[PDB]
Amino acid sequence: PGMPAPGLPAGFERRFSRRYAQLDDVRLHYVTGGPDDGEMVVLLHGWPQTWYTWRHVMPALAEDGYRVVAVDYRGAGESDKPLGGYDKASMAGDIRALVHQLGATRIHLVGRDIGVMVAYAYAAQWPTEIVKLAMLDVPVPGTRIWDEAKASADPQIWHFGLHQQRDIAEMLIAGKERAYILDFYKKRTHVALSNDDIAVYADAYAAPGALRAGFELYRAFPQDETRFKAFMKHKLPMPVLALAGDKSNGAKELDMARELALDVRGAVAPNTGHWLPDENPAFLTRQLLDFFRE
Amino acid sequence: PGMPAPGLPAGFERRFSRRYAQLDDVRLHYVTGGPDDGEMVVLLHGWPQTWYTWRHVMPALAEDGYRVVAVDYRGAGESDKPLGGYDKASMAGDIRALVHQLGATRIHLVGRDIGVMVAYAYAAQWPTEIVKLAMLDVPVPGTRIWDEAKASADPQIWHFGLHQQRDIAEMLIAGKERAYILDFYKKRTHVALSNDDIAVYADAYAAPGALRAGFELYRAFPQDETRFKAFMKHKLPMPVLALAGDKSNGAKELDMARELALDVRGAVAPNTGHWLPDENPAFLTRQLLDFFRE
Amino acid sequence: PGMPAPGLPAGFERRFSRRYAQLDDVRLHYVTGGPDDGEMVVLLHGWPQTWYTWRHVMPALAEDGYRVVAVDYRGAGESDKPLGGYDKASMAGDIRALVHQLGATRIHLVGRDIGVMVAYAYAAQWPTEIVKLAMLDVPVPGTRIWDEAKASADPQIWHFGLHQQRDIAEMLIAGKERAYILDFYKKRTHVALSNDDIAVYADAYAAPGALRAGFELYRAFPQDETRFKAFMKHKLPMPVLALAGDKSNGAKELDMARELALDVRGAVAPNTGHWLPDENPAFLTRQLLDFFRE
Amino acid sequence: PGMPAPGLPAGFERRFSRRYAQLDDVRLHYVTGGPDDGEMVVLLHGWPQTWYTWRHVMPALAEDGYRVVAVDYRGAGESDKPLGGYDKASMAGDIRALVHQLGATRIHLVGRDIGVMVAYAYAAQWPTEIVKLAMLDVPVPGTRIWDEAKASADPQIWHFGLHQQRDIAEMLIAGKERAYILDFYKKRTHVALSNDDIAVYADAYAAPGALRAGFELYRAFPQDETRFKAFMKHKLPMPVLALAGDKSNGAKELDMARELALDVRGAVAPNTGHWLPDENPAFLTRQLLDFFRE
Amino acid sequence: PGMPAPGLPAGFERRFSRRYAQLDDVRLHYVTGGPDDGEMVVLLHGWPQTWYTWRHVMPALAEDGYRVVAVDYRGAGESDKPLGGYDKASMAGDIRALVHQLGATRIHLVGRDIGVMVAYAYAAQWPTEIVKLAMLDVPVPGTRIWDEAKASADPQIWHFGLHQQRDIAEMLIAGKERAYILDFYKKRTHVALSNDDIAVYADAYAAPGALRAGFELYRAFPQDETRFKAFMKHKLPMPVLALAGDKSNGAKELDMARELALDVRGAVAPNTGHWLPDENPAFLTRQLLDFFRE
Amino acid sequence: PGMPAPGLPAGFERRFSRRYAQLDDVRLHYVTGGPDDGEMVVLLHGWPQTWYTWRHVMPALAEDGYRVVAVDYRGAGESDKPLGGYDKASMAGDIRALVHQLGATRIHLVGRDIGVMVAYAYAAQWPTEIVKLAMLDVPVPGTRIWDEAKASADPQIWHFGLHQQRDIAEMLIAGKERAYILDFYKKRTHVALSNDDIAVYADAYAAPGALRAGFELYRAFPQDETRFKAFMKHKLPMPVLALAGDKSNGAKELDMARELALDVRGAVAPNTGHWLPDENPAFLTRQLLDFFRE
């Protein structure tokens, strides 16, 4: 029993900090906590999200001694909104430059949606640098699960077309970010979420340039498909964990991951929709802690 | 003495949960609490309301051992907004499918306004399934009390015309839901309500499709009148309780119910307007608990 | 054959003029032409209209030697929008003050919709001053045709309720006058009209105070119903002509007038909707000229 | 020392209640507390205010055993917004009908701004019914202090012209109530107020009809001047207290009151602007308690 | 050589008329000309269009002795916007009811885009009533050309997804009809069109309910695909003409029609985009006249 | 007889030109025609106007051999909107700089409203440079007619207060220039004007800075009153003509001018309101030509 409880979990404000990393062109925002010497765990959100999606996962990771780094990737949240560089492979390079600036090289990596595309491109480009990789909720371009949704005209990716209309998508949705993003979020959730938590994301995407930069991730999709099919000719060597909720992609996340990697295990969260960190963080953290210590 | 106190009563968040039920086409949102094995009590709001109207009635019901289920019916609150199915008889079928999915068959049923129309159609269609039925605040289509308001051009149903103008009602009221619904609410209340509580409803009706779906309930009224007069040829067998406030429909709710059912008792809430759950929940819960245990 | 031709008929601008008349507490705008000494013919529009509705009738009246006076009544068009005086009997006093100010006493009088209510209250209050009375399109309060529409809850008067909600009607429709009024107009026409001509009306009602003043005509209906029923105990002595289109009120305009007057004749315009001067001015003009010279 | 503290004082919510009084046409909202048998004290706000302006005065009055009744007069706050009746003498009749419905006859009366006009008209019309009258902040129509501001074109009454423009004032200020009313308030205050408290008023005047009804008080001013000069031919018999802040009308409030009444005492609040209940409630309550018990 | 010439061709206004036809539950608007006894030719527009798209084709048809009937189908232009009936087969029933109401039985039938789907469902349901059928610009559901576009995720149907999001599409595009529709139109044209002519379409879709009604055409596509595949088991017996521009669907219009009909001929307009009646009416008119007299 | 004819008179476009003059800190826009060597006649508009108000007077002046110069003064029309210099005496310096820049020294000078204040300050500062002075419609600060209007609180200057509220006036009226200015204009006219002509003025004041610059004319009134009273100790020596309409200031324009000048003649236009050049240019033109050649 219990009504949705919005906001950061108790004690969060004391153990995490907001920080910036200046890369060559772009400044990235991220939130970090946990032991300065711990194994680094990087968490990458998707669309329409920010670092905030991980709020209920980050304390448990830090309390198990991980150095937690939750990044607003290029164009999202409080990060800069540059003109280009929104293909996932180049965005993986942004994350890597941030990791190196923090003194790390080998990391654990967790991604969902656009972030799982970024994460995969990070592992394909620098396989020796990713100790373990966890893949949540969405398939990556290049996979058959991806191609099947496209050829089916799957209802839950209806928005790819709209988002790929340069200037038209921005003109339609500017000023209506909250109504658009709340509707998007609730149609894919199964666990009841708080409007206040979803509004944290929506307000981020109403900031100047946030809509455009979010949509350019979609507009780079055909480039990602080409780049990713090339990546897929070399299966990933490191252990991979695939998770998704049963009301959304479910077992297809693990099907998808097996086309990508040699060493794969997976699970399906019960009574959970599209937003694993929002909807079922308890299941997510237990799976990650067992995976990372294994 | 006491100024209006907005929000959920103390302790509510701990004993109730928000949940979804997927029916064949439509997903319905509801809030539930109380013993899992208790006799189920279903509560149906009206226009412009959500489950939230019952917030002060639900804890007392659960504490007397009832399994409380307060539903956002088709098109309202956090439920889906489909193209059609807004005649009350079909909406009663939605509620019944939800009840069956929760493992129940025989229920106690409470409705107000549009919800009392839905509730009545539930009892007329499946009379053996409704153990007791409580009817609040508004008469149902087909009754003489209903027809008399229409032929009188009663001032408090001036909005039937406007709401029945497809697209015109939405175009006029979109963007002004809060000013429109607050004015609507306060003109029919007698006990002073908090603007914050009324704004919970208004914000629900500003969500995409909520205005249209709310208005299609009105646009189905001529169909309901025909269906309901057919229902009324067989009087209801189960005990029925009729309640309304003295500043609004008052004793006419009990007059109305006697055309519908054989076994009827009623009361009039003192110094109470149109919104019995908002205005006088203490009177309402005492009447319901005496009725349900009798 | 022929597409709708917007604007004033050829040669109108040269033969008619716009003028203002300052009365005690209202300035009225009116348009006039024809011989300065001719028998005066006064034409009264309704809602949502101005004098401009008579554009196709006025030249023929003037060319037959009548002094044509087309009035924007209190609150409409370019007339003033005072605080009160929107009961039809008091508005008929405005028209009389204007007629007297122009040097005339006996008039021929033509009204439609709200203007036919004003016209009737003019004839009832000063019967010796009305030579002949023509009644178009809409029944007047107090008649059985009026009372039946309300008790039937006739769909074509759905807007009475909305218009009687003070401040609520203005707030909903302000800024949407064109969309509101063009939809209202086209739903009641049968002859295709030009959007440019309907936009002349719509733009008049967007001017400061024009919505309020128009709606106050509706808000005075219960006062009008009481007053007119008293007028109706004395049937009018002067000749009366009743006209309406077959796609709208048709023969009921003549039924209604026979309750008001002793000397009544009528006709029904074929393939004509609610707006006789806009839709079929040729039929109207022939009827008015035959009646006036008879 | 101390930053402005917004909101109701501690303990207010427990000892006061919001209630309605239905008069013949109009429903008035008021807030009341204190002993049911105590001498009644009625408090009348001005423009742009509601009962809320008295929040810091009402507890001290109740704790000295007064039955406190703070009214939203006709058109303001949560009261109805009728078509007319905004001349102060008729508004005094509304307050008297409310007082009688509460079982009282003899009262103490406090008014400021428009409310002090209402209060004075109450005392002039029913002098035996007003035990003591306190007059704050603004002079009443008919006085020389009033006429001198008008002939001077005093800057702080620049808005009389604008407010007296029917429909133009509403069209300019609708949607900008908060910016307009905050600017109005701060330009006349001397003690720093909280924006949150001023926003309580501004939001009240953005409700449907609140702007129009507020402005009709100004539009009745020429009628009030005539009525009030007639009232002034009979000086008031009961004791009168005149108060104002030194940064605003100051000693002119007592000058003004001496043209109205025979038995007059006054004081000037130090370092206090136009809004005595908002700015210096401590000075105000001490003056009222000494006056009422004297 | 020549700049775009906006508006109706010279002499059109005199030879054609706008009319309404009241059917059971829909009033349809249409434009007609030519001899009252000529063989009837019905022209059906698509999205986002009205009858006005045929402006340059209708005079030549009438001058060759055809009775021209250009229909605004259910929900479009000046026609009514009912709640349902937007599956193409049911809309073909509207067109037939109109044809019969005009005294005709056998017709020549021309459609493009949504209108070519309606036209096909008309010929499939009542084949003996269609003398000849001309199919322009767009393939119909159920054909291989239609199925390939969806499985390819063809860029030029990106909007199907958005248009199928009920309430979301309306909320995003309301108030932006002109910018949305002019961009949509120009991206698919090859001949330069006048903004004034495209604005005729855009303004029609800004009218109350026009966005909803248009999008409901898209929302019925899965129902249409099922129905049309059943129609396609019986190839049409009457002669069929297929036309499309070379910069858009080109020869695929004839490929598609040979899957639907036994007797098919076609041509491809040179240097012509998606909008044959707007871009190259001279080519279209010659093709239609040669086909009709053959 | 005749309906309002909007626009420039026939043949105007060919005989007059728009030009700019760069002065030290302001660029002024003006319209000129007539013989390059003729005696110069300068025409100065008021609020809310531009040079366009003289459209019907300028051709007759030019055809009589005058060099016509109609100026948009500092801040108005197409002139610059600098930060200051809106006291009339300094603005008269702008006009003189322009006259000298055009090669002239002695001028005939015509002003109405704000332009008649500028014109008077021009004649008072450089009396030998003004051959004859014509004063229209409005009294100037410092005169008894001006002082009486303020002390009477004359209704027709209600807007002085609003216009003097810096930033508040701009915020309220921005975006509502057309509705604000058309209402202002029509309340002071007696001859019916075309909305299209008043909209020329209204659109000029919607341009960036035009509201501020116009209101700064009002905000300088107390500076103007002081300066003009000093000018008035020396009555003007050159011949003066005073004109105004009988429905507005009438004979008071001549009363006012006799306080300013020794050699004064005047006339009152019959059935003419506040806007002499718009309402009765024929009367104005005859008066100006007889005066100039006398």
Residue numbers in the entry:
A (entry chain A), B (entry chain A), C (entry chain C), D (entry chain A), E (entry chain C), F (entry chain C): 11 to 304
Passage from the reporting paper:
Here we report the biochemical and structural characteristics of Cfl1 and Cfl2, two Cif-like epoxide hydrolases from Burkholderia cenocepacia. EHs that belong to the α/β hydrolase superfamily of enzymes utilize an Asp-His-Asp/Glu catalytic triad to open the epoxide ring substrate and release the vicinal diol product. Cfl1 and Cfl2 also appear to utilize a Cif-like His-Tyr epoxide ring-opening pair instead of the classical Tyr-Tyr pair. While Cif and aCif exist as constitutive dimers, our hydrodynamic and structural studies revealed that Cfl1 and Cfl2 exist as octamers and decamers, respectively, by forming rings of dimers.
